[PDB]
Amino acid sequence: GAGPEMVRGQVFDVGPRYTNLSYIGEGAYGMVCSAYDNVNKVRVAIKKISPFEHQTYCQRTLREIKILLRFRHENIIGINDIIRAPTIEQMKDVYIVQDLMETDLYKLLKTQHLSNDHICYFLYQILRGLKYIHSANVLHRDLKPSNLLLNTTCDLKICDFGLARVADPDHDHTGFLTEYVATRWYRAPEIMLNSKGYTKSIDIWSVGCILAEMLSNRPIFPGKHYLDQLNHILGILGSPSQEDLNCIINLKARNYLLSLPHKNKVPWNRLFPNADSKALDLLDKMLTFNPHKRIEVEQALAHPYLEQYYDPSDEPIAEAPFKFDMLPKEKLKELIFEETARFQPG
């Protein structure tokens, strides 16, 4: 037998392939449950998305689905299945089925001490995933511990491409105090000053923040708002050099930085006295104020800290990069319909 499976007085219509549900959380803009995949005979995660009333959530839903169905990588979360109605008129929701991952690095960090071996392995897998992402001309733009999933053997997978964009360094520049929606604590300094976050260097900064967080179990730059985020960064990195200021042409941004009291660099080894010296060398090169001087993903992978794992032939790049920048919600619904048709019985 079957019906329209309910969860918490809530339509969670995923059968017949997915049975014995269990409510988890309120996700991003939908309920998330776990369920037993009767084909693969293992439990899975299913997210309910209801985006069709809003052009905005249509675009984010289509982009995420496009990106995750295009990408195929061990260190990036895959879409196993997409459940929706057989007709556009009847499609009100979409269910995205993914591997059930047992935890994530945010949860892990608040509960568990990480060994240096764990920090190394996690960092390796983050950058391995990121190399692929970046090779597809895509920026994640929201890397943080909660977007790094882990299973019980510490396999790590990057998730949540909600804010992801095709790279666009020619259109990165903007004015001072430009609004930006990614999570504060992992935003690069240039986002507050002169950058829309359209270059690969914004993701490396986030990885740097994540590394620091793995070393101490707490966020390195927990800014309480826009400019406090920046005062946090400069209290550790120290005031930017004249050279670095000269790369900021925008006068509001440059004059802001010049108005601040001088701050001296805090040595990494004093912030993290138990950390591996090679980890601190690599941390230093990712958390560089100047985005142009910031280490690249490939260089990070080649750094001595990761030498036990480094294997470029086993660090794949994307077959089919997103060549270009990727419209009413009615069109986006049809686009979502078309993009998800491959999962329909047939």
UniProtKB/Swiss-Prot annotation:
SMART domains: S_TKc. A motif (Nuclear translocation motif) lies at residues 320-326. InterPro entries: Kinase-like_dom_sf, MAP_kinase, MAP_kinase_CS, MAPK_ERK1/2, Prot_kinase_dom, Protein_kinase_ATP_BS, Ser/Thr_kinase_AS. GO terms for biological process: apoptotic process; B cell receptor signaling pathway; Bergmann glial cell differentiation; cardiac neural crest cell development involved in heart development; caveolin-mediated endocytosis; cell surface receptor signaling pathway; cellular response to amino acid starvation; cellular response to tumor necrosis factor. The keyword RNA-binding does not apply. The keyword Membrane applies. The modification Phosphoserine is found at residues 22, 239, 241, 277. Residues 252-270 bind DNA. Keywords: Acetylation, Apoptosis, ATP-binding, Cell cycle, Cell junction, Cytoplasm, Cytoskeleton, Disease variant, DNA-binding, Host-virus interaction, Kinase, Membrane, Nucleotide-binding, Nucleus, Phosphoprotein, Repressor, Serine/threonine-protein kinase, Transcription, Transcription regulation, Transferase, Ubl conjugation. It is linked to Noonan syndrome 13: A form of Noonan syndrome, a disease characterized by short stature, facial dysmorphic features such as hypertelorism, a downward eyeslant and low-set posteriorly rotated ears, and a high incidence of congenital heart defects and hypertrophic cardiomyopathy. Other features can include a short neck with webbing or redundancy of skin, deafness, motor delay, variable intellectual deficits, multiple skeletal defects, cryptorchidism, and bleeding diathesis. This is Mitogen-activated protein kinase 1. It comes from Homo sapiens (Human).
